[PDB]
Amino acid sequence: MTHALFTKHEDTLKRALAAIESRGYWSPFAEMPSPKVYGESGNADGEAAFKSHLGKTFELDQPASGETVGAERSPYGVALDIRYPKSTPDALIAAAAAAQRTWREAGPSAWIGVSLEILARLNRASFEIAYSVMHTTGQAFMMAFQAGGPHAQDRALEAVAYAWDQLRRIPADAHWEKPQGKNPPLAMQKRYTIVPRGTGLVLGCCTFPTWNGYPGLFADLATGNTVIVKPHPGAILPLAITVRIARDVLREAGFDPNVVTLLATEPNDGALVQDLALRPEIKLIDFTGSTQNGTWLERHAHQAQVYTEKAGVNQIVIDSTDDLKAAAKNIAFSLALYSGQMCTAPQNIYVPRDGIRTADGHASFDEVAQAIAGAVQKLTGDPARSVELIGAIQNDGVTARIDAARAVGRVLLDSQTLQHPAFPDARVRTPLVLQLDVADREKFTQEWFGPISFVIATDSTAQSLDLAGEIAAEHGALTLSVYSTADDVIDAAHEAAVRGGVALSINLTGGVFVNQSAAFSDFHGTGANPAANAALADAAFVANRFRVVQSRVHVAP
Amino acid sequence: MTHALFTKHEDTLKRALAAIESRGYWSPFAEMPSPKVYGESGNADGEAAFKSHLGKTFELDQPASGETVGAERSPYGVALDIRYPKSTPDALIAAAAAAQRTWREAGPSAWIGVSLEILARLNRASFEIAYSVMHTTGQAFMMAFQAGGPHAQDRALEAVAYAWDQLRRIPADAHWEKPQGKNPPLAMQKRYTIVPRGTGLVLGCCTFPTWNGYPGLFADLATGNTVIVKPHPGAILPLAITVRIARDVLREAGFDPNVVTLLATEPNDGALVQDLALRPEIKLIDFTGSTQNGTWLERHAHQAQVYTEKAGVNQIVIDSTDDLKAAAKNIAFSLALYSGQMCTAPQNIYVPRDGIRTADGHASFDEVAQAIAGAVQKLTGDPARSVELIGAIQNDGVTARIDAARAVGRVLLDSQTLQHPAFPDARVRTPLVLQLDVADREKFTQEWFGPISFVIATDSTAQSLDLAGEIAAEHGALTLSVYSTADDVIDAAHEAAVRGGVALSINLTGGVFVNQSAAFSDFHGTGANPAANAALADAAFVANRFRVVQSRVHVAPK
Ligand code: NA
Numbered sequence A: 001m002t003h004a005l006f007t008k009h010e011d012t013l014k015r016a017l018a019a020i021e022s023r024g025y026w027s028p029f030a031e032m033p034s035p036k037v038y039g040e041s042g043n044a045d046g047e048a049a050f051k052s053h054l055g056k057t058f059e060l061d062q063p064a065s066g067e068t069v070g071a072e073r074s075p076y077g078v079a080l081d082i083r084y085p086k087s088t089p090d091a092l093i094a095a096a097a098a099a100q101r102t103w104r105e106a107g108p109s110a111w112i113g114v115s116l117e118i119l120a121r122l123n124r125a126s127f128e129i130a131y132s133v134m135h136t137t138g139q140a141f142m143m144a145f146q147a148g149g150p151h152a153q154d155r156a157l158e159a160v161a162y163a164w165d166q167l168r169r170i171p172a173d174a175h176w177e178k179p180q181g182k183n184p185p186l187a188m189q190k191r192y193t194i195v196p197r198g199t200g201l202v203l204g205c206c207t208f209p210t211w212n213g214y215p216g217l218f219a220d221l222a223t224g225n226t227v228i229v230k231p232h233p234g235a236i237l238p239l240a241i242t243v244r245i246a247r248d249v250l251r252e253a254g255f256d257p258n259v260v261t262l263l264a265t266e267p268n269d270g271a272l273v274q275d276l277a278l279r280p281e282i283k284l285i286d287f288t289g290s291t292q293n294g295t296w297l298e299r300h301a302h303q304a305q306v307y308t309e310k311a312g313v314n315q316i317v318i319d320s321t322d323d324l325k326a327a328a329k330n331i332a333f334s335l336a337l338y339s340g341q342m343c344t345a346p347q348n349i350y351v352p353r354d355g356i357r358t359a360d361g362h363a364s365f366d367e368v369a370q371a372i373a374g375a376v377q378k379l380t381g382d383p384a385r386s387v388e389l390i391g392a393i394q395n396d397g398v399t400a401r402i403d404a405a406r407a408v409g410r411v412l413l414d415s416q417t418l419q420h421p422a423f424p425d426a427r428v429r430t431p432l433v434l435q436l437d438v439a440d441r442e443k444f445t446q447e448w449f450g451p452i453s454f455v456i457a458t459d460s461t462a463q464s465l466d467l468a469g470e471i472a473a474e475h476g477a478l479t480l481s482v483y484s485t486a487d488d489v490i491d492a493a494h495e496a497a498v499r500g501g502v503a504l505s506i507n508l509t510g511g512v513f514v515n516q517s518a519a520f521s522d523f524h525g526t527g528a529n530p531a532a533n534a535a536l537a538d539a540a541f542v543a544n545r546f547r548v549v550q551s552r553v554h555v556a557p
Numbered sequence B: 001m002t003h004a005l006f007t008k009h010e011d012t013l014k015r016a017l018a019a020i021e022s023r024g025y026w027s028p029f030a031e032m033p034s035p036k037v038y039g040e041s042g043n044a045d046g047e048a049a050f051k052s053h054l055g056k057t058f059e060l061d062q063p064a065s066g067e068t069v070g071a072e073r074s075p076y077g078v079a080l081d082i083r084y085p086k087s088t089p090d091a092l093i094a095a096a097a098a099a100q101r102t103w104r105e106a107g108p109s110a111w112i113g114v115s116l117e118i119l120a121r122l123n124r125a126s127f128e129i130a131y132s133v134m135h136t137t138g139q140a141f142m143m144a145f146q147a148g149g150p151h152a153q154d155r156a157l158e159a160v161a162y163a164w165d166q167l168r169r170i171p172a173d174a175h176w177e178k179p180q181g182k183n184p185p186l187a188m189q190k191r192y193t194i195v196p197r198g199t200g201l202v203l204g205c206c207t208f209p210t211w212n213g214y215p216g217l218f219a220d221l222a223t224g225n226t227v228i229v230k231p232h233p234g235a236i237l238p239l240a241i242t243v244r245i246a247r248d249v250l251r252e253a254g255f256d257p258n259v260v261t262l263l264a265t266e267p268n269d270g271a272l273v274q275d276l277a278l279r280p281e282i283k284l285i286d287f288t289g290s291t292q293n294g295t296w297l298e299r300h301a302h303q304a305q306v307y308t309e310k311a312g313v314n315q316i317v318i319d320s321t322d323d324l325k326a327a328a329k330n331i332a333f334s335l336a337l338y339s340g341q342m343c344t345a346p347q348n349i350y351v352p353r354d355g356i357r358t359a360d361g362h363a364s365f366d367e368v369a370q371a372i373a374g375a376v377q378k379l380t381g382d383p384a385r386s387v388e389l390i391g392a393i394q395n396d397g398v399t400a401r402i403d404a405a406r407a408v409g410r411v412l413l414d415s416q417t418l419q420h421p422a423f424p425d426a427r428v429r430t431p432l433v434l435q436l437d438v439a440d441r442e443k444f445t446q447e448w449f450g451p452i453s454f455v456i457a458t459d460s461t462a463q464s465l466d467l468a469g470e471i472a473a474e475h476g477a478l479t480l481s482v483y484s485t486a487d488d489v490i491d492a493a494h495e496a497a498v499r500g501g502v503a504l505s506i507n508l509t510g511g512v513f514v515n516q517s518a519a520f521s522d523f524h525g526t527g528a529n530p531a532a533n534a535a536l537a538d539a540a541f542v543a544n545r546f547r548v549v550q551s552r553v554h555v556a557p558k
C-alpha cells in the first residue's frame, strides 16, 4: 500500500516531475525570508533556536562514545563552542546496518514520502538553518537563508523527483506470456523488488553544507539507502540540524532513526575519513571538496559509487558588448558575491589585447580592465554598503593566498580588510583583481580559492575561446560566460562549452549572474569534465543507487 | 529535424518503450528460423555468405597497416582460415575521433534511427551470423541462430529503447521566466545540447559475442558515441559481420563509417587491451569475461565508465517438489544446454543430506542425485540425439578443466567424448556430474567453466539457502533456482535472492530453463554482486553515456 506521507505530498511530487522535464521556472520553497510566508516571528524564533545551540552539546540519540567533538568557528567572530557526541565509524556503520531492513521493506512510496516530509520540515526551520549557515560558512544572512534553506531544499527535492522518476517506471510485477504455436503458451509471473545499495556516505562542504550536501543525502534516502552524514568540520551545525529533523520524521514514521546518523569530526579527520570511505559497507559516496581529495576517493573506494564535486576554472570571455558599464557591473557582482567563495564564481576573464567593440565605440584592453576593477571597487569598498554582498571569509588561509596572488601579475585592484559594522572580529576582505597575459597560463589554470580574479590579455577572441574550451575540458569548470554582439562568436562559444563540458551563459548584463543556478532548469555541473563526475541532477545521478532483484514462476496463461 | 531512419522505425521504437515498462513478452525479431519470415532460401543464402568469408581476408575500408590478423578455429573442426585487416589502437582512436563531430551533431534522432536500421539489417543477416557464431563459439545451429541473431538483436533493441527513454525526457529548449515582486520578470531561454561521452570500447566474449556484445555497442551508438569493437580472438567473425553492416548504414546515412571500427587481434592480446583501455580517448568500456580482467578495468580505467559481466556461481536449491522426474529433467536440460558454457547455467545443486519431500513420498539424497545424473545421461550420451542440444566445446582449456574436476569428488556421471555424426573433427564432451558435501566449500565456490556440476549434500534447506545467498553475494551469481512446495521456503528463497543480488527462478519443471532470459522482461544480472557491475538493461545502463551541455540567454518575457 501507498505510504501516508507519499499521498500527503503527492501533488508537490507530481509538479516536480513535470518541472524536471519542462525545465521552466518552478520552486515550491519561498526563497524570500518574508513574514508573509514564514510568520511575523519567523526570523526571531529562528535566531533564538540557533542561539540555543551555542555553548552546549548538540543532542543526538544515536550510538555515541560519551566523548564530544567539534571545533567550529564563526567567520563573523561570534563564539560558538558547539559540541557534538562523538560516534565511531564502527558504531555508525552498525547502526545503519541495523536500520536498513525495515527501511528497505517499506519500498519507494515510503522513501519518497519520508524524504518530502523532511524537506517540508526543513523549510519550516529555514531561519534557524540560515543563522547556522551564516556563522559557520560566513555567508551574509540573505545568501545563507537562500543557499542554506529554500535553494538547498529545491535541489534536495529535485533529487527526490529524479529518484521517483526512475522508480515509478519499474512495475511491481508482470504477466509474461509467450505463445508456442498451437502448443500451450509459456506463462510466468515476474516479480520485481527494488533493493537499495546499502549505506551511503555524505562528505560535506565547508561553504555550501546544505546546498552541496542535500542532493546526495536525499538521493540516497529517496532510493532506500541509509546515510552517514560527515560534514565539513567547519560547518557541522547546518547538517546536524538537518539530521535531527530527518530522524524525527523517520522515528514518527515507524522506522529506525539511525537510517540517518551524523559523524561529527574535528580538523585533521583525514585518516578517519579515508578508512571510513573504504569500508565494505559504504556503497555510495557523495563528496564535495578539493580536487585531490575527490580524485583520491574516485580512485580508491572501489566498493562504492562515488559522486564528486571538485574545483574548476570558471571563465569569462569578453569579445564585444552593447554597454561596457552594464557588463562590467554584472561581472563585478559575480566577483564580489560571497567574496568569490562560490564554486560557480568566475576567475579568468579573457579580453583581447587589442580591445573590444562596444556600443560607444572601441574600448582598449586597459579600459575594459579599469571598467571591471572600478565596478568591483564601487560595489565592495564601503563597509556599510558592501558587507551584505561580500559576506565573510571562510578560513584564515585566504589571507595568505591573497598575498601569494598579489605577486602573480599586475595588481589592478588591491584586496583590503574591512571592519564589519556589526561584528568587530569578523574576517572580511574585498576582492583582489590582477592583470595577466595569456603567456601566464601556468598561473591561471589553477583554482584560487577566495576573491581572486585575473583579467587576461589574449591575442584574439578566437584564442580566448580555444583556451577557455581547452582549460574547462582539461582542468574542469562549472561555468562559462561570454560577452559578444556577434552571432558567429556566440556560436563558437557554444562549441567551446560543448568541448569544455560546461554550462554557457550569454551576455549577462542584468540581474542574473553566472554564479546563480535554478533547480529544475539548470544542471549544476555536467559530469563531463574534471570539476565533477556527476550533474546535479539528472537520471545518472540517481539511477544506480538502487538495483532490481526479480523472481519468476510459472502461472496459468 | 527528425532523421528519416527515426521516422522509419518509430513504430518499433514506441512498442519497445512500452515493452520495457510493462515487462510482458515481446520481440520484433522472429526467433524461429522459419522460411515464412526469412525467405525459402534464407538458410542456404546465409550459409553461402558464411562460406564466402573462409580462406580470405575480411574486407573493411577502415585505417589499416596492410598486415592481417586472425587465428579463429571452429569447435566443429571446419577449416576457417579467416583473416582481418590489422589496425592499431592508435589509428582506430584517431579515425573514431575524426568521425565524432558530424555524428554528434546529428543528434538523438539520428543515433536512434541509425541504430534501429542497423538492427533491421542484422536481422536480415541472421542466417549468415548464425553460422559465424556456430563455427566460432561451438553453439549448435538453433542456439547459434537464436542467441546470436534475434535474441541478441532483442537485447540490442532493448538497449536502444532505454537510451531513447532517457534522451526523450530532455527538452531541446525551455522558456525560463521568474516573477519579480513588482519588477520585470527574469526571462531567459535555456538550450540543452545532448553531448556523447566520446569513444566507447566493446571488449568481446568468446561464447556469446553478439548477445553479450550488442548491448554495450548499441547503447554506445544510440547515445551518439563512436565505438571500437574488440572481439575475443576466438570469436571475431560474428562481430566483424556486425561492424560491416553498421558501417554500411552509417555510410548510407552520410556519416563517417569510422563511427564503428573493428580491432581484430591474435591471442594473448591482454597487454594491448590494457594499453587501449587506459587511453584518455576511451570514455566508455563494455566488457564480458573473467572476474580478474573485469575487475582490473573497473579499478584502472579511471577515465572511463566501465560496465562489466564477470564470473559467478550459479546455484540450485532443492527443497521439495511435486514431480521429481520433471524437476530432474529440467535441471538436466539446464546442465546440458551448450555443454554448460552459458553464463547462466547452474553449477551448484544443494540437496539436504536427509533427502526431500515429494508428492510421491520421500526421496533420499542419492535418489535425487541419481535422478539428475540419469536424466543428464539420457539427454547427452548419444551423439545423434544430443549434438543439437550440447553443441561443441569452445576450446581445449574446457577439456582440461573437465579432467581436473574428475579428481574433486565422487563422480555421479562421467563426461564422455562423442563422435559428431556430421563433423568428424568436432570437439564434443558430455557433462560431468559430481557429488560433494557442504564441507567441500573450497571446491564449489570456484568457477568451473564448462559442463561441470556438483550435487552438494547440506545439513538442511535452511543451510542450502543461507549458503546460496552468501556465495552469490561474495562470489557473484547470475541465476538462482529453487525447488520447493513450501511457501515459507519460497519466502526464504526471495530473501536469499535479495541478499545475493541474484535473479530467482521458482519450481522450473517445464519448458523454461534457468539458463534462459527474455529481453524486455528479464534483467540479465543485477549489478549488485561480483558477477557484474551493471544490469542488461536498465536506466543506469545508459543514462551516463551522454551528458547535457546547456546555455542560457536573456529574452523578452511572455
Ligand atoms: Na573565486
Ligand code: NA
Pocket: B339, B340, B341, B342, B345, B346, B347, B448, B449, B450, B451, B452
Ligand atoms: Na557450467
